[PDB]
């Protein structure tokens, strides 16, 4: 029933998801034009943790002896202290990371932080590590500009929908958003240099990978997601070895637009 009900639902060359009517059924497949195959339980740090801890990890204040980057992590460290121009960028960064906090804590009212997201980033760096034998001892060689300003462009290039106009472009943004959070969560100035002494190269590398590794994760216009989704559901349904109407029968109850549940409940807070 499921299969015969979704057969003709595929992702067309515009990233729309339709059927023989050309009727839309999802503007951007999966609400993120990504092929489920390339996704792993990433962790969006920028959401949990104490309001306190957040600072200790993402805050970078050059206009301060205790909140600056001890130049053992950075190279241009000492000569940056007080630079009020960099504390502007360094502030937009911290301003944004915090908008994220109050964004994620909004979608994920729950507080949960482990979710399905394209381009595994912990590994993409884990390798970034030993690939350049990076020694945490000696100091990096990036600029508060190198980091902050390159990550900004990393995003400019995680294209999903291509379209040359507002309506389309504005969708692009939407469709990504969440990933990027994950991005700034893990490519934050402090984190970048203090958590894993990322050389200039090492970083410049991690970036390109994240980019194409992303681009690959996108969905291929061709996918017959209808027949897919159906199976993917009706499959773990046959594996359902079964006081509220549970699984198997209930599932049927649903698909039928059950004109009167067996169990009806009504949990009120």
């Amino acid at each position: 029933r499921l299969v015969k009900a979704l057969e003709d639902i595929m992702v067309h060359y515009d990233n729309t998801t339709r059927n023989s009517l050309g009727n839309v059924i999802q503007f951007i497949y999966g609400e993120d034009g990504m092929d489920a195959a390339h996704i792993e339980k990433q962790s969006l740090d920028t959401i949990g943790g104490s309001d306190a801890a957040f600072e200790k990890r993402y805050r970078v204040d050059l206009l301060n002896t205790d909140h600056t980057l001890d130049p053992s992590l950075l190279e241009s460290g000492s000569e940056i202290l007080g630079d009020l121009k960099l504390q502007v960028l360094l502030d937009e960064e911290y301003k944004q990371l915090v908008k994220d906090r109050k964004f994620l804590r909004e979608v994920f009212v729950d507080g949960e932080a482990n979710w399905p997201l394209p381009v595994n980033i912990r590994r993409i760096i884990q390798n970034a590590q030993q690939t350049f034998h990076i020694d945490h001892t000696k100091p990096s060689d990036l600029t508060i500009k190198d980091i902050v300003l390159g990550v900004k462009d990393l995003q400019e290039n995680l294209l999903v929908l291509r379209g040359k106009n507002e309506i389309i472009q504005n969708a692009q943004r939407d469709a990504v958003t969440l990933f990027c959070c994950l991005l700034r969560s893990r490519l934050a100035t402090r984190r970048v240099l203090q958590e894993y002494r990322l050389t200039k190269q090492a970083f410049d590398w991690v970036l390109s990978n994240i980019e194409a590794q992303f681009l690959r994760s996108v969905v291929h216009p061709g996918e017959m997601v209808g027949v897919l989704a159906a199976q993917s559901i009706g499959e773990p349904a046959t594996q359902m070895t079964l006081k509220v109407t549970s699984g198997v029968p209930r599932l049927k109850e649903i698909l039928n637009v059950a004109k009167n549940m067996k169990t009806p409940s009504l949990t009120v807070y």
Partner: protein, 97 residues
């Protein structure tokens, strides 16, 4: 062996375009009839030899097509026809959309 529904769905999923068709036709039914370019029926009197194509009644003998479909569907059509149902076939389209 039978490559029934279950298996079809499977291939669609896979994106296995050609292959599905190949097992649906060449490795099975695969048949050929002639159409009147007008009344989308199998009427045509294919004399594949003197080429005459007539399809009279509709009277053509000039505007005709050859199509490959599964003898099953061919049947399914005469079968629908037998119940006074006309399942016309058109080599082109107009609806656009």
């Amino acid at each position: 062996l039978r490559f029934g529904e279950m298996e079809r769905d499977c291939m669609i999923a896979h994106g296995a375009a050609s292959f599905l068709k190949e097992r649906l036709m060449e490795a099975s039914d695969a048949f050929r009839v002639h159409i009147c370019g007008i009344c989308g029926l199998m009427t045509v009197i294919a004399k594949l030899n003197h080429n005459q194509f007539e399809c009279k009644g509709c009277d053509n003998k000039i505007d005709i097509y050859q199509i490959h479909i599964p003898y099953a569907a061919k049947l399914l059509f005469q079968e629908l026809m037998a119940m006074n149902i006309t399942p016309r076939l058109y080599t082109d389209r107009s609806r656009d959309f």
